[PDB]
């Protein structure tokens, strides 16, 4: 058996930051464990994690592909002539290009290991024996061949999460985002089940690569898609997805999925509504991946959902064992998991305890059109503050008066503490909003006030200068109002 | 002589802001004078000024149209299959749509004047007889028919700038950006003379709408284009212009232009090289437009190049005559002129002195690819502070590896005062950098430091995210580079 300072189980966004930082900057002997080295089936994620293999990186490439549907249509207004009846998308080419890109990054991570002192990769399933030794086995099965036993001082769990499935009749006929990245054919008709951002992102990808006459339906249990986002922005996004032809079936949930003779799936909705689809993708949530780790043999314990309970510095109850990223169920985004992996190495190896601030974290939804969002939604702000002011504007860019997509309203909403003037949250809908929100997030982790925003001079013509053009509140909340 | 609180000569960006404010906010009686109500020859600019009519707004529509040449080409990498030989630009469709968009905006300004009691528009050439009477004549000739003689308490001079010409033989065969907005056919071969943002932006418009086998040359008298911008960015923009096929000709200046029998124009350069072009457009400069105002008749000092000299509150030597916008030669951007108009009304009519801060003002170059810049370039900063640190990052977006456009590097450069880490300048090259620099300008107005920047968590995947990723300096200046 070998002796290590650290064993990282999971070589994703968090574990690879942590392991690399511990080995190079702190000259520690570190083992990182993951299931496989190259992206794809059987385990989908691999070296580099979910984001690089089956997450942020392939989905942004595929959403960029999807946007060309609207740009080739919108170019006509600006005088571009082409035979538009000949245009045909080519899913196969998109996936071949995407896989080339993702494998490039995988080969880069292998290089990274050859370049560094005490960092070794170990391929297999990590499971805990006791709080000081982790087993690398042949499969998730507890009775599989144990390949290696690693003796350690500190253990770091960073196994991520996995797609949540529906407990329904014919769940087995449904795919998740994982299989969606390797689909051989673009579906003609497809159902994305779920109201979250992964559902909405894929619905816009399938909508663009479908055969014309095809259809993509987005079915969600609640009233408006995208819980946790600004309610006005959720309302306008819905209509803009509908305007681009996807059918948002609100208050619909699968009940039965049955395979038809010709491979297609037949689905019975909870309303007794029925429809047939080439693909049914569940995008209903992500659960902490912790079940197989045998945490119990080391005394570390979980929450009901599988989340590993951790204090602010990422320490679990057994002290030499820490946990970061999606398995921790704090904020499930790559920059947060990376930040936590770095903070952990200052805390145990540099012995400077850094806790990661999961507050005012900005994020985006690469839907068509996209959203960039940071801080508080007004309902939450109005529960915590006395005087909340909501500022809002909407405009159709002059541009879309000429492209013909007049339904593309840019919307910006800013929530303030009206006593203070401190900007509590900024929520944007429209193109470039993911680019624009990163800088606004610096303004908010700095404590800007609405006077800071309208005293800056605008850069013209941009959509972003609206941020600097809003001075009168639309309405306020003194516990309530609207 | 009649009875006015304010007469504003020049109904443009600054001029109209001040006139609306003085009237609807402070109930003053104000006359706004301009040459023309709608865009187009002979005066090109008209009600709404240069930006609305022959500036920011027409220009930006036209460069978004030009950008379709790249994205239609780039779609192929993402699997969008189409008849590549069918694709052709129609310049007539582009300027027809641009003219309706600008005609809409002109109509709404006439609307504005109907909806506000003390505001009136007077068409003609405004000139001063005395520091309390302004006469609007029929033409710019001092001896022309006086149409109106308005008598006024205050005068606001906001006549903007005009294109600068070359005094060479055949200058009258060249156009400026004014005429380029009404060209009937896109040039097959074109020459853009100048190195500032306006010839850069038109070179990209002409490059995209040219007939195949065409060519646009950019000729500049100096060593490198975009004097006054970050030197690494200028170098990199030149190389990206060349990769998209435009021919950048440094140390090059025309000597004489003659018209060919063909109708095209023959250009002899000062090096002795010759070539023929359909269009030769001069974008060598813009000079303050004070020349026919009769400023000596009111004793107001002009600064040689034409700039009306003013103090921080935009007051001239004559205490009831103020001047704003491009005529004062301070920052020739529409936002700055508007802000100066607002500040002016506060100071004289709301009796609260303001002054525009012309520092940290961000701006954008709508080149293909675009640039977004704010603050000091390192050279200037190095001659004011003892230790300046420069941070930079370059990367090709993943997407540009899939599309053909491998040359499209995104670059961000941050200049810091190394004493406390205060960010003095951020210079970016790449798509969306105009949209990103607007909110970075807010962080800069609030006194941001490099640590504010890397302590914000990123939004992944975005280009803007690179802002939060720069911890270590590339090099420093301790008076000189190190
Ligand atoms: C489709 C999709 C889109 C997303 N898009 C974005 C986006 O645009 N921006 C963003 O910020 N976030 C996005 N996310 C979220 C982001 O991918 C994750 O939050 C982030 O990767 C979490 O990092 P992590 O370190 O917790 O784990 P991960 O990056 O998931 O890595 C965990 C690693 O552990 C390995 N592993 C699992 N169990 C074991 C075991 N027993 N033994 C060994 N190895 C094991 C896995 O194979 C995996 O490689 C997206 C996620 C998905 C699924
Ligand atoms: C092609 C081009 C592109 C530009 N793009 C941008 C951009 O993208 N973003 C940006 O911020 N800035 C841009 N600018 C600069 C911007 O157009 C100007 O800075 C801005 O319009 C200046 O405002 P102003 O109030 O000083 O006067 P202007 O807006 O120029 O208006 C001056 C007015 O005075 C009138 N006039 C002049 N003489 C007389 C007279 N004697 N009697 C009566 N009326 C008179 C003119 O018709 C005109 O309407 C661009 C400029 C050009 C030329």
Curated annotation (Swiss-Prot), chains A, B:
Optimum pH is 7.5-8.0. It is an enzyme of class 1 (oxidoreductase). GO terms for molecular function: flavin adenine dinucleotide binding; glutathione-disulfide reductase (NADPH) activity; trypanothione-disulfide reductase (NADPH) activity. It catalyses: trypanothione + NADP(+) = trypanothione disulfide + NADPH + H(+). Disulfide bonds join 51-56. The N-terminus is blocked. Homodimer. PANTHER family: GLUTATHIONE REDUCTASE. This is Trypanothione reductase. It comes from Crithidia fasciculata.
């Amino acid at each position: 058996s070998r002796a290590y300072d650290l064993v990282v189980i999971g070589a994703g966004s968090g574990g690879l930051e942590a392991g690399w930082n511990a080995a190079s900057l702190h000259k520690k002997r570190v083992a990182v464990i993951d299931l496989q080295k190259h992206h794809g089936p059987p385990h989908y994620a691999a070296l580099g994690g979910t984001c690089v293999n089956v997450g942020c990186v392939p989905k942004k490439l595929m959403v960029t592909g999807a946007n060309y549907m609207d740009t080739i249509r919108e170019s006509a207004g600006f005088g571009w002539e082409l035979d538009r009846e000949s245009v045909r998308p080519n899913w196969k080419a998109l996936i071949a290009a995407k896989n080339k890109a993702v494998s490039g990054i995988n080969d880069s991570y292998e290089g990274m290991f050859a370049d560094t002192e005490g960092l070794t990769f170990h391929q297999g399933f990590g499971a805990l024996q006791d709080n000081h030794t982790v087993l690398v086995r042949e499969s998730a099965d507890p009775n599989s061949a144990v390949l290696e036993t690693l003796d350690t001082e500190y253990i770091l769990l960073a196994t991520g999460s996995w797609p949540q499935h529906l407990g329904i009749e014919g769940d087995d006929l449904c795919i998740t985002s994982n299989e969606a990245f390797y689909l051989d054919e673009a579906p003609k008709r497809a159902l994305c089940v779920g109201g979250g951002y992964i559902s909405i992102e894929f619905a816009g990808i399938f909508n663009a690569y479908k055969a014309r006459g095809g259809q993509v339906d987005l079915a969600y249990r609640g009233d408006m898609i995208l819980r946790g986002f600004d309610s006005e922005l959720r309302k306008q996004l819905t209509e803009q997805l509908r305007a681009n032809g996807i059918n948002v079936r609100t208050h619909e949930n699968p009940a039965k999925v049955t395979k038809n003779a010709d491979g297609t799936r037949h689905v019975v909705f909870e309303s007794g509504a029925e429809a047939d689809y080439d693909v049914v993708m569940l995008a209903i949530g992500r659960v902490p991946r912790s079940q197989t780790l045998q945490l119990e043999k080391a005394g570390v314990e979980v929450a009901k959902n599988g989340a590993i309970k951790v204090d602010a510095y990422s320490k679990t109850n057994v002290d030499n064992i820490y946990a970061i990223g999606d398995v921790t169920d704090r904020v499930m985004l790559t920059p947060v998991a990376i930040n936590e992996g770095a903070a952990f190495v200052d805390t145990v190896f540099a012995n400077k305890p850094r806790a990661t601030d999961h507050t005012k974290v900005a994020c985006a939804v690469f839907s068509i059109p996209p959203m960039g969002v940071c801080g508080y939604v007004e309902e939450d702000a109005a529960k915590k503050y006395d005087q909340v002011a909501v500022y809002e504007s909407s405009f159709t860019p002059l541009m879309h008066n000429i492209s013909g997509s007049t339904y593309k309203k840019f919307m910006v909403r800013i929530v303030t503490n009206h006593a203070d003037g401190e900007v509590l949250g900024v929520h944007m809908l429209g193109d470039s909003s993911p680019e624009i929100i990163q800088s606004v997030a610096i303004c908010l982790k700095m404590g800007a006030k609405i006077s800071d925003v309208y005293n800056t001079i605008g850069v013209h013509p941009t959509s972003a200068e609206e941020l600097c053009s809003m001075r009168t509140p639309a309405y306020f909340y003194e516990k309530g109002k609207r």
